[PDB]
Design an enzyme around this catalytic site. Structure first.
Site, mmCIF file in Angstrom:
data_model
loop_
_atom_site.group_PDB
_atom_site.id
_atom_site.type_symbol
_atom_site.label_atom_id
_atom_site.label_comp_id
_atom_site.label_asym_id
_atom_site.label_seq_id
_atom_site.Cartn_x
_atom_site.Cartn_y
_atom_site.Cartn_z
ATOM 1 N N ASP A 19 0.811 -1.227 0.000
ATOM 2 C CA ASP A 19 0.000 0.000 0.000
ATOM 3 C C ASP A 19 0.843 1.275 0.000
ATOM 4 O O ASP A 19 1.933 1.288 0.572
ATOM 5 C CB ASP A 19 -0.897 0.054 1.244
ATOM 6 C CG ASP A 19 -1.761 -1.180 1.423
ATOM 7 O OD1 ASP A 19 -1.621 -2.155 0.652
ATOM 8 O OD2 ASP A 19 -2.594 -1.165 2.354
ATOM 9 N N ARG A 144 -7.865 -1.692 11.305
ATOM 10 C CA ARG A 144 -6.657 -1.130 10.705
ATOM 11 C C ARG A 144 -6.912 0.019 9.727
ATOM 12 O O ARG A 144 -8.059 0.308 9.376
ATOM 13 C CB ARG A 144 -5.848 -2.245 10.024
ATOM 14 C CG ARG A 144 -6.434 -2.760 8.718
ATOM 15 C CD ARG A 144 -5.718 -4.011 8.261
ATOM 16 N NE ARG A 144 -6.456 -5.221 8.614
ATOM 17 C CZ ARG A 144 -7.094 -5.998 7.743
ATOM 18 N NH1 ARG A 144 -7.089 -5.710 6.446
ATOM 19 N NH2 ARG A 144 -7.738 -7.074 8.170
ATOM 20 N N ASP A 235 -12.103 -5.927 1.067
ATOM 21 C CA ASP A 235 -11.140 -7.024 1.101
ATOM 22 C C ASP A 235 -11.683 -8.277 0.415
ATOM 23 O O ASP A 235 -10.916 -9.079 -0.127
ATOM 24 C CB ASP A 235 -10.724 -7.330 2.541
ATOM 25 C CG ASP A 235 -9.373 -8.022 2.624
ATOM 26 O OD1 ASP A 235 -9.273 -9.040 3.342
ATOM 27 O OD2 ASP A 235 -8.411 -7.553 1.972
HETATM 28 O O1 LIG Z 1 0.475 -4.292 4.841
HETATM 29 C C1 LIG Z 1 -0.839 -4.682 5.171
HETATM 30 C C2 LIG Z 1 -1.828 -3.685 4.582
HETATM 31 O O2 LIG Z 1 -2.372 -4.193 3.376
HETATM 32 C C3 LIG Z 1 -3.794 -4.229 3.411
HETATM 33 C C4 LIG Z 1 -4.401 -3.671 2.125
HETATM 34 O O3 LIG Z 1 -3.539 -3.911 1.033
HETATM 35 O O4 LIG Z 1 -4.297 -5.538 3.650
HETATM 36 C C5 LIG Z 1 -3.585 -6.634 3.097
HETATM 37 O O5 LIG Z 1 -2.852 -7.305 4.111
HETATM 38 C C6 LIG Z 1 -3.636 -7.899 5.138
HETATM 39 C C7 LIG Z 1 -2.710 -8.520 6.179
HETATM 40 O O6 LIG Z 1 -1.798 -9.393 5.555
HETATM 41 C C8 LIG Z 1 -4.610 -8.939 4.571
HETATM 42 O O7 LIG Z 1 -5.508 -9.362 5.575
HETATM 43 C C9 LIG Z 1 -5.415 -8.389 3.395
HETATM 44 O O8 LIG Z 1 -6.052 -9.464 2.736
HETATM 45 C C10 LIG Z 1 -4.549 -7.603 2.402
HETATM 46 O O9 LIG Z 1 -5.383 -6.892 1.509
HETATM 47 C C11 LIG Z 1 -4.186 -3.350 4.587
HETATM 48 O O10 LIG Z 1 -5.355 -3.826 5.206
HETATM 49 C C12 LIG Z 1 -2.997 -3.443 5.518
HETATM 50 O O11 LIG Z 1 -2.824 -2.255 6.250
HETATM 51 ZN ZN LIG Z 2 -4.161 2.794 3.741
#
Ligand SMILES: OC[C@H]1O[C@@](CO)(O[C@H]2O[C@H](CO)[C@@H](O)[C@H](O)[C@H]2O)[C@@H](O)[C@@H]1O
Ligand SMILES: [Zn+2]
Ligand SMILES: *[C@@H]1O[C@H](CO)[C@@H](O[C@@H]2O[C@H](CO)[C@@H](O[C@@H]3O[C@H](CO[C@H]4O[C@H](CO)[C@@H](O)[C@H](O[C@H]5O[C@H](CO)[C@@H](O)[C@H](O)[C@@H]5O)[C@@H]4O)[C@@H](O)[C@H](O)[C@@H]3O)[C@H](O)[C@H]2NC(C)=O)[C@H](O)[C@H]1NC(C)=O
Ligand SMILES: *[C@@H]1O[C@H](CO)[C@@H](O[C@@H]2O[C@H](CO)[C@@H](O)[C@H](O)[C@H]2NC(C)=O)[C@H](O)[C@H]1NC(C)=O
Ligand SMILES: *[C@@H]1O[C@H](CO)[C@@H](O)[C@H](O)[C@H]1NC(C)=O
Ligand code: NA
Ligand code: NA
Ligand SMILES: [Zn+2]
Ligand SMILES: [Zn+2]
Ligand SMILES: [Zn+2]
Length: 537
Positions: A19, A144, A235
């Site tokens: 991200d 989060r 998600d």
């Molecule tokens: O770095 C984690 C960050 O990524 C996000 C969105 O891209 O969520 C991703 O990572 C999560 C934890 O591994 C997963 O549950 C999810 O499927 C994935 O999209 C953010 O939620 C998070 O801050």
């Molecule tokens: Zn963000």
């Protein structure tokens, strides 16, 4: 060697990127943090990597700012945002993983406010400021991504954190009057039953008429009329959706306009590969900038083999459309500086049924191209089949080989000499089922024939465009080796796709304008610019 590394798109020198994190402008300098694996091409050991720019195109590296070093973030430093306090001071709210694997909200602020690159950040030993517990009943495993915080007319700060409870997505709002003690508001800003986790939320105002950005905290002038946009990353579907509405400051709830619903049926920023979007106010040019993450469409095996994964889209300017129905995005004008002084130009050329036109004299794997299509007779367009509602399903049911009265016409990008590999971006025009003279314009990005390599993500993306086919149809594409960003109707529809061609690379790539529809179409104007590389790290 690296035939799929982008020339001018933002990506780290190596391995896994995630991200975009806390984008902002401080002391005239642009900042972009991001989720990064400092030792792997897959997700893991995630830290806040740090780069800076003066033009949002060329980026200079810095050591990771936020990394596991304390109880409140010991098992990871997840996504977050940057707020700029009214005294110019910037702060970051981010999600940390604690000793119990709980998602908690931590504050961080710069160590040396005189350092314009903000190299080192200090964390308050009072963290976490926001955490799940027995009384709030918040899902510890889904709490989060805190947003940029805004200050209300009652001198209290508001911030939302994306969460969920039993298949219900919600934006939990918090209140503070000192930005240190945060209390949970009894009710969320908004919620939706059915849609899963409400990741990467965003909340920002926009003017009803104008291109200019609005400050996040702004209530606007007594003369200026404002609307609000709530954006979320589902998600479950892995897409970014937004709705437009009004911010009831009394009840502290977001109320979407008549017609909108905050789920998988809401408008998207980008109808291709595009996730975890975040915006920031650019006080330098009074514009709102959108950052988006595009992950890899290749197999995971290929990612570790090449030793990197994940790029960042070239930033977009965002504003509200005059009709108030949707947002418009356009690549920041700074990217236009990368254009070669030399420019290939074609105008008033006629692509008849089943024809192609190669664009000579451009670096075809790293270029910018703009087309204007003029349709001759609009009543030659086929009438839309009754139960055709999903634009992505239209583009996959009928590829470039299946012809309409009007369409397919558009571009074939990243193409091999003899067309074994090509990624096609095109239009189709239908008549609407209504009583009036309404038309449906379809924009597809077909990558089924994009690469000879079998095990790549070949998913075709689709979108409707809100333009009038009486006027010439506008299509733009930024081409960068393994990524193509398609823009229909002057940014009214955006599609990002990821392509890894085995033949169409560098010197061997080509560029075509085409038409396979029954009726011939006019290419009013065509401009291709070879694109210079950017200094990114
Ligand atoms: O770095 C984690 C960050 O990524 C996000 C969105 O891209 O969520 C991703 O990572 C999560 C934890 O591994 C997963 O549950 C999810 O499927 C994935 O999209 C953010 O939620 C998070 O801050
Ligand atoms: Zn963000
Ligand atoms: C990170 O990148 C990875 C890899 O690129 C992403 O994971 C992949 O995500 C894509 C989807 O984005 C998936 O790939 C394919 O999914 C397709 C699903 O099948 C539908 O495709 C069309 C509509 O979506 C449509 O043509 C088709 O309709 C047909 O079947 C229907 C019944 O199901 C019915 O309507 C009709 O009968 C019709 O004929 C399908 O509905 C499809 O192309 C393939 O099946 C393929 O799986 C993968 O699931 C993902 N791959 C991996 C590696 O898991 C990931 O999303 C990215 N993550 C982020 C954060 O962006
Ligand atoms: C709280 O959130 C967690 C995380 O999503 C939920 O646990 C997950 O449940 C899903 C079922 O849809 C499965 O994928 C796994 O069993 C869990 N995932 C992980 C990785 O933990 C949990 O159900 C939620 N609880 C409540 C009460 O909302
Ligand atoms: C902060 O940064 C400034 C400018 O780079 C530097 O001169 C100064 O030494 C730093 N502040 C202190 C006292 O550590
Ligand atoms: Na913030
Ligand atoms: Na701009
Ligand atoms: Zn520089
Ligand atoms: Zn989908
Ligand atoms: Zn029919």
């Amino acid at each position: 060697n690296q035939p799929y590394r982008t020339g001018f798109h933002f990506q780290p020198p190596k391995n896994w990127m995630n991200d975009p994190n806390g984008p902002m402008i401080y002391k005239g300098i642009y900042h972009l943090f991001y989720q990064w694996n400092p030792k792997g091409a897959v997700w893991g050991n995630i830290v806040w990597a740090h780069s800076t720019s003066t033009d949002l195109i060329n980026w200079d590296p810095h050591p990771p700012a936020i990394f596991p070093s304390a109880p409140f973030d010991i098992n990871g430093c997840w996504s977050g945002s940057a707020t700029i306090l009214p005294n110019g001071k910037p702060v970051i709210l981010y999600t940390g993983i604690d000793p119990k694997n709980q998602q908690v909200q931590n504050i961080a602020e710069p160590k040396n406010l005189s350092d314009p690159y903000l190299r080192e950040w200090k964390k308050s030993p009072l963290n976490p400021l926001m955490a799940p517990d027995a009384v709030n009943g918040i899902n510890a495993s889904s709490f989060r991504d805190p947003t940029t915080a805004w200050l209300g007319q009652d001198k209290k700060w508001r911030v939302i954190i994306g969460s969920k409870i039993h298949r219900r997505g919600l934006a939990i709002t918090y209140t503070s009057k000192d930005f240190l003690k945060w209390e949970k508001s009894p009710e969320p800003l908004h919620y939706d039953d059915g849609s899963g986790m409400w990741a990467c939320p965003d909340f920002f105002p926009v003017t009803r008429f104008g291109s200019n950005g609005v400050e996040t905290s702004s209530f606007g002038e007594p003369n200026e009329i404002l609307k609000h946009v709530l954006k979320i990353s589902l998600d479950d579907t892995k897409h970014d959706y937004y709705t437009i509405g009004t911010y009831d400051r009394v009840k502290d709830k977001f109320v979407p306009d008549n017609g909108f619903k905050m789920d998988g049926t809401a408008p998207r920023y980008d109808y291709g590969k595009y996730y975890a979007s975040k915006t920031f106010f650019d006080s330098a040019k009074n514009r709102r900038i959108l950052w988006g993450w595009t992950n890899e469409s290749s197999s995971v095996e290929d990612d570790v083999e090449k030793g990197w994964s994940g790029i960042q889209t070239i930033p977009r300017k965002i504003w509200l459309d005059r009709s108030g129905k949707q947002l418009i995005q356009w690549p920041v004008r700074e990217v236009e500086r990368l254009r070669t002084k030399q420019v290939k130009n074609l105008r008033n050329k006629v692509l008849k049924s089943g024809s192609r036109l190669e664009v000579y004299g451009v670096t075809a794997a790293q270029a910018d191209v703009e087309v204007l299509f003029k349709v001759r007779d609009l009543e030659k367009a086929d009438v839309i089949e009754p139960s055709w509602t999903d634009p992505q399903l239209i583009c996959s049911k009928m590829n470039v080989s299946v012809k309409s009265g009007l369409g397919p016409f558009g571009l074939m990008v990243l193409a091999s000499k003899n067309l074994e590999e090509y990624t096609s971006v095109y239009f189709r025009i239908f008549k609407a089922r209504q009583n009036s003279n309404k038309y449906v314009v379809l924009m597809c990005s077909d990558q089924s024939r994009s690469s000879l390599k079998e095990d790549n993500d070949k998913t075709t993306y689709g979108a409707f465009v809100d333009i009038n086919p009486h006027q010439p149809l506008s299509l733009r594409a930024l081409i960068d080796h393994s990524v193509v960003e398609s823009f229909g109707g002057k940014g009214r529809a955006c599609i990002t796709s990821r392509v890894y061609p085995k033949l169409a690379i560098g010197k061997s790539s080509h560029l075509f304008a085409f038409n396979y529809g029954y009726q011939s179409v006019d290419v009013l104007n065509l401009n291709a610019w070879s694109m210079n590389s950017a200094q990114i790290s």
